[PDB]
């Protein structure tokens, strides 16, 4: 008995672990569980590749499951780690299986940086090992038949899934062994051999000759088509070709011998003889020409015994005419066999070591959701602040609401009194003065950290350069200059950040000293404050003036509008939607993730109720300011201009402006502080990254 199998492809060993670990750590928070279990996984993955591929040796189902295990695992990894985005220099190198190319060689290799290459090759080896296990089977035996029939149909299916898979993965020309045409021929050889096994099972089980003829004819159909595919392309080892031809003939002769036993049974005697004669011719021919590859004697003895016995009976008794082959009905065909679809998992007891890991597709949708959400929220905050700033400025330049609460010109208007006490409560000028004083100190701290860090790199570099000059032979590591350039680039980066911060300190210093004194007044206790604001005569027709009640009410609703901006801002900030689960769904039920359309509709459900109100705020402000200014323009006409109330008038406008400035400055000075504090965080880490690289070197 002789069946075709395929030899395994050889690979060079490659470290799977360390290029994958580089990513894992750059993805998740260092020193955590979501980074612990994945490094334990990527190293066991590297080991598994070694057991699956590292040696072409073992030859039974123990080593096959390990190969299948590896196939399934590699297919499970793909949607995680970013392979569909070329930048990992994990490059796989395989040899052609058959020592075959489209050039005059002895061997040919292909190194490729692709998982699609890795998985075609593993699959091919899965297929090939399966073919070898099948060929080894004892076909006298019911477990043998069965294991052979299942392995050939596996190989055929694996070979065929490679055929439909190679090109779109392998963005190159594949080695001959894994190219569509070869792999389509291998698939058909494996299917033909499965049919062969089923023909043997039916024979062993003493099934009807009509069934056996049809299973054998079908096997011949498969073998003939594979033979034909080989006739004008030599891509398989040298033995494949004549074995296909012999097996094609043997399966025809079998078809004919069984159909002959059918003709006899039906008393078609000349037909028995013509079919036996054909069987004999085919087998005579197989024995002379393919003697090296098959043994066919028993079958030939059996044909001859049948032929002689049938010719004795015909010549003496029946006198039936022997027809020509061309006038005989075709024997039918019956396939019992199929190419096994490839569907991960193909191994028994499979578990994805990286199942818990989130697909890359989701990150580049979860991080992208963030940049759209952030755009929307900041945008909204900024619009509102910029609006409130503009309203307060307009109000101040019109002495509102002070003017309308200014009964005489003798006391502190209630609103200025409210703002004053509000400034005093927040600590008065002491709080601004203290924050101004420490801003140069939080700057200096950060400069010290950046500078101490770069000094380190410099020190180490100097001694490294001096050791290379003196101990040329004893001292050859890559220079410090080169190891350090990545860190030195973060260095000059941080420098740029610190400069923009200094410029920002400028704006805040200039503002603070330009507004200090008026603020100091606003913070004085109420009787003292009153004495410093000039008195004036009331323009007494401010009883229940209608131009006043309108201004009062317009200003009240403008107030309403700006207090409402605070809750809007806080709710804009306090809410969030975790979007992972949505993306999980969109990916598991559909092909890919369409984040653009999916996030926009979610941002609209979560933030729409708020972005609506924010836009309604601006328009409402625009309405209010327009007719506040046409209403004031009338109000000023009624109450005249002398210098006693002009002076009081400026002092009041300037006191309202002082309040806006205390408020703007406290906030700028806190933004400054937080910035300079969070920058010490980032820079302490940087100091450690520098001391670590100088301690290892």
């Amino acid at each position: 008995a002789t069946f075709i199998s395929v030899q395994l492809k050889k690979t060079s060993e490659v470290d799977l672990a360390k290029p994958l670990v580089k990513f894992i750590q750059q993805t998740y928070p260092s020193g955590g569980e979501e980074q612990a279990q994945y490094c334990r996984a990527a190293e066991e993955l590297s080991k598994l590749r070694r057991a699956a591929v590292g040696r072409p040796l073992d030859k039974h189902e123990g080593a096959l499951e390990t190969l299948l295990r590896y196939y399934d695992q590699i297919c499970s990894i793909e949607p995680k780690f970013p392979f569909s985005e070329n930048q990992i220099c994990l490059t796989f190198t395989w040899k052609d299986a058959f020592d075959k190319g489209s050039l005059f060689g002895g061997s040919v290799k292909l190194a490729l940086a692709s998982l699609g290459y890795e998985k075609s090759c593993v699959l091919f080896n899965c297929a090939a090992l399966a073919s070898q296990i099948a060929a080894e089977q004892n076909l006298d035996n019911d477990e043998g038949l069965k294991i052979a029939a299942k392995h050939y149909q596996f190989a055929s299916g694996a070979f065929l899934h490679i055929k439909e898979t190679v090109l779109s993965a392998l963005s190159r020309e594949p080695t001959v062994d894994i190219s569509p045409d070869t792999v389509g021929t291998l698939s058909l050889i494996m299917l033909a051999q499965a049919q062969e096994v089923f023909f043997l099972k039916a024979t062993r089980d003493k099934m009807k000759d009509a069934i056996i003829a049809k299973l054998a004819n079908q096997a011949a159909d498969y073998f003939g088509d594979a033979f034909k595919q080989c006739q004008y392309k030599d891509t398989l080892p040298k033995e494949v070709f004549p074995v296909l031809a012999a097996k094609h003939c043997i399966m025809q002769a079998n078809a004919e011998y069984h159909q002959s036993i059918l003709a006899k049974q039906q008393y078609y005697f000349g037909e028995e003889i013509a079919r036996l004669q054909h069987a004999a011719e085919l087998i005579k021919t197989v024995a002379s020409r393919y003697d090296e590859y098959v043994n066919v004697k028993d079958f030939s003895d059996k044909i001859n015994r049948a032929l002689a016995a049938a010719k004795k009976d015909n010549d003496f008794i029946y006198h039936d005419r022997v027809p020509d082959l061309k006038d005989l009905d075709p024997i039918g065909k019956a396939t019992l066999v199929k190419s096994t679809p490839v569907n991960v998992p193909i191994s028994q007891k499979f578990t994805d070591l990286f199942e818990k890991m989130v697909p890359v597709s989701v990150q580049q949708s979860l991080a992208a959701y963030n940049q759209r959400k952030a755009d929307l929220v900041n945008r909204s905050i900024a619009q509102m602040r910029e609006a409130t700033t503009l309203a307060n400025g307009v109000l101040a330049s019109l002495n509102l609401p002070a003017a309308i609460e200014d009964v005489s010109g003798d006391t502190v208007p209630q609103s200025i009194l409210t703002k004053s006490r509000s400034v005093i409560e927040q600590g008065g000028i002491q709080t601004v003065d203290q924050l101004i004083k420490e801003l140069p100190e939080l700057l200096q701290r950060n400069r010290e950290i950046l500078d101490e860090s770069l000094r380190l790199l410099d020190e180490e570099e100097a001694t490294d350069n001096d050791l290379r000059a003196k101990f040329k032979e004893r001292w050859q590591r890559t220079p410090s200059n080169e190891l350090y350039k990545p860190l030195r680039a973060e260095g000059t980066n941080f420098r740029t950040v610190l400069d923009k911060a200094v410029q920002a300190d400028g704006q805040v210093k200039e503002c603070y000293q330009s507004h200090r004194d008026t603020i100091v007044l606003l913070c004085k206790p109420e009787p003292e404050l009153n004495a410093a604001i000039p008195s004036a005569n009331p323009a007494k027709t401010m009883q229940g003036s209608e131009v006043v009640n309108v201004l009062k009410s317009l200003l009240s609703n403008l107030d309403e509008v700006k207090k409402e901006r605070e809750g809007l801002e806080n709710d804009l900030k306090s809410v969030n939607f975790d979007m992972t689960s949505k993306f999980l769904t969109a990916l598991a039920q559909d092909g890919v993730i369409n984040e653009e359309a999916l996030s926009v509709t979610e941002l609209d459900r979560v933030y729409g109720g708020l972005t609506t109100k924010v836009q309604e705020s601006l328009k409402k402000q625009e309405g209010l300011l327009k007719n506040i200014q046409v209403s004031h323009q009338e109000f000023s006409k009624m109450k005249q201009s002398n210098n006693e109330a002009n002076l009081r008038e400026e002092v009041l406008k300037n006191l309202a402006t002082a309040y806006d400035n205390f408020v703007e400055l406290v906030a700028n000075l806190k933004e400054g502080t937080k910035f300079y504090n969070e920058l010490t965080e980032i820079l302490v880490r940087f100091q450690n990254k520098c001391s670590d690289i100088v301690f290892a070197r």
Partner: peptide, 11 residues
């Protein structure tokens, strides 16, 4: 923007 909270956050 006053202080470079943009540069700081992406770091």
């Amino acid at each position: 923007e006053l202080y470079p909270l943009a540069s700081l956050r992406s770091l």
